[PDB]
Structure formats: structure tokens, C-alpha cells
Amino acid sequence: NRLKEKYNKEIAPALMTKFNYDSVMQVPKIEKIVINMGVGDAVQNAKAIDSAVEELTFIAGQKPVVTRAKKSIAGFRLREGMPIGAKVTLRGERMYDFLDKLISVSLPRVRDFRGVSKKSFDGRGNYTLGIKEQLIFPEIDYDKVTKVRGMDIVIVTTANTDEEARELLTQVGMPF
């Protein structure tokens, strides 16, 4: 709730008069957040899928999809199927809640934390957080952690060029 009001009131006039848009609708909005999991031990660890079907339901209560491999790879011992990786897409109120979890609460707990990279924008206006330790925001509970499998967060704006997505995500609260 609070990040929407922060976004509207503080950000939309400031970003609108910072980048001089020809309409109110050109102002970029964070549309969706995609949480990749990328568990490839489903082949080698048949139970492991429940790991991050267990964990990513607790990471965000939208249950991730047990996603399947679309092409057979012989070097990985894997036919089409044998499902690989979980996936959350996120738009609504929980997503500004999730960036509220990331910015203000979680990103201190990165145990080697510095400026997360400026050079992680694709050239279109979208961002990914590459996570190496799956316990960052306090729900994850070391007690309930054996497999350390991290996470990929894909923050997707509606930005047409890239540095205005930069100036969006700096102003929302992501440090760099």
C-alpha cells in the first residue's frame, strides 16, 4: 500500500518533471516482478522440485509453477519434460509489498553486501537481482534451510529507454 502512494505522490511528479514526458501515461511503472528459481537438480534429485515449491510459496504466497524443459539436452541427461525450475510472476499489491521487503528489510542481510551492479540492465529498461543465498528476508528460517539454492528476481518496468528505469529503481529504493 505504502509504496504505491510513495510512487504516485513523490515519484510521478518528480520523474515526470525530470524526464519531461508528453503525457502522464509515458511515466514508467513497474509492471511485473518475475521470480526465477532455476533448480536444475530435478533431473538428478527427483524430490528437489518440492524444494522451492516449499520455499517460493513462502517467499511469495503466489505458488510458483513447476516449469518443464522445452528441449532435450544430452549433456544434461534430460528429455523434454522432467520439469525444471520454478517461476513466480507478480503484479498487484503484493509486488510493491515485495519491493518493500527487498529494499527496507532484506538487502541488509546479504552477508557480503555492497553496491549491487549498475551494469545489470539489458539495454531496454529491465533489471535482475542475482541472489546467492536464499535467506535474505527473515521468513526463510535457517532451521528450515538445507539446500542453499538462490534466486533470480526480474523487476520489469514499462520504461522505453534504460536510464530512466535506472532513475526509477534508484528512487524506489534499490541501492547501487
Partner: protein, 120 residues
């Protein structure tokens, strides 16, 4: 970037899937449905002649409704479709739900035309 295609582009595609299997023949004219945000529209089309025979819209200042986008607006425009289809006597017609479900305002149109006397 992220860009999405329109409702209208996917709607015309999902309509063009529908159009391969039913057309506005003689004595089964095609009863088409368009679903604007603020109104709803319904034509009765011959596809051999390329001519719509009867028509009814909620964009009619006569016999207006308040909400105009409600399911009751769709029921009133469906009975108007069938009423104009009764005044020019086709009496038997084939329902084109146009790239939509058979669910809401479209199903309200269709149920209203089935009640008022268009034999789908």
C-alpha cells in the same frame, strides 16, 4: 520495454479462428457481437452479399439504459436485435460470439435473442 498486444489484435485473431467455421449464409445470417467498454453492439450480417440486414446497439438514444455496459444492457440490446430481426423476417440465425467467451454480456445477448425468438 515491456509491450503487450491490444485486446483488439488478439480479439481479431480469436475472431478469425471463429470465422473459419461459420458465415452469414442465406436464411442463416451471421449474428455478430462487438464489446466496447462503454457500449455493446450487435449486427446481423449476410456474408454472401457483405450486407448487414438488421442491427442493434446500446448506442441508441432511444430506449436507453443507465449503465450501458451492464449485462442488463446486453439483454436489452439482444431483445432489440431479435425485435429488428422480427420486423424484417429472418426467423432463424447463427450466433457469432466474436472472439470472446460465451460468458457474460455476450451470453446475455445470446440468451435474450433465444428468448425473444431467434433460433440459434
Amino acid at each position: 520495454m515491456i509491450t503487450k498486444t491490444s485486446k483488439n489484435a488478439a480479439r481479431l485473431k480469436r475472431h478469425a479462428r471463429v470465422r473459419a467455421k461459420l458465415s452469414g449464409t442465406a436464411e442463416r445470417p451471421r449474428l455478430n457481437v462487438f464489446r466496447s467498454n462503454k457500449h455493446i453492439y450487435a449486427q446481423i450480417i449476410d456474408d454472401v452479399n457483405g450486407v448487414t440486414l438488421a442491427s442493434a446497439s446500446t448506442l441508441d438514444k432511444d430506449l436507453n439504459v443507465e449503465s450501458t455496459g451492464d449485462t442488463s444492457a446486453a439483454t436489452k440490446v439482444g431483445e432489440l436485435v431479435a425485435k429488428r430481426a422480427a420486423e424484417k423476417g429472418i426467423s432463424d440465425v447463427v450466433f457469432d460470439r466474436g472472439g470472446y467467451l460465451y460468458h457474460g454480456r455476450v451470453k446475455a445477448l445470446a440468451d435474450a435473442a433465444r428468448e425473444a425468438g431467434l433460433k440459434f
